[PDB]
Amino acid sequence: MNTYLKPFELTLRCLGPVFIGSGEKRTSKEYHVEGDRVYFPDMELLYADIP
RNA sequence: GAAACUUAAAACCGUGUUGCACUGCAACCCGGAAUUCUUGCACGUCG
């Protein structure tokens, strides 16, 4: 600490899901599911290998 | 004694640099102080 500046330690444990949005929304033409797990590939790496 | 100009003519003139050498020069910070800062949940509403 310091003799005029007093810090603390704020710890947050989530009991439910937490969503802090970024302003970004992804369409269905970027990901595709496999059972329950949905895969998010890199958008430029799947374009570079395609001829 | 009464009567007849020591007069006439003649430039104080000719030639000649107020000229020769000489740095308005030497030394000197446009320098010292100053937060592009203060407030703000990527969120609300579901026959």
Side-chain angles (χ1 to χ4, degrees):
Chain A
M1 53 175 56
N2 204 271
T3 339
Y4 107 102
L5 234 53
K6 305 300 179 299
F8 294 91
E9 283 195 313
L10 179 63
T11 310
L12 306 182
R13 191 60 186 269
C14 49
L15 303 183
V18 174
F19 174 72
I20 303 180
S22 174
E24 179 81 14
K25 180 253 307 171
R26 304 171 185 176
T27 345
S28 184
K29 296 171 171 54
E30 186 178 331
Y31 56 90
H32 96 281
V33 304
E34 182 173 23
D36 271 333
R37 311 194 71 167
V38 36
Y39 177 53
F40 290 106
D42 283 4
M43 53 190 64
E44 64 137 32
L45 293 186
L46 87 105
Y47 179 84
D49 62 328
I50 283 183

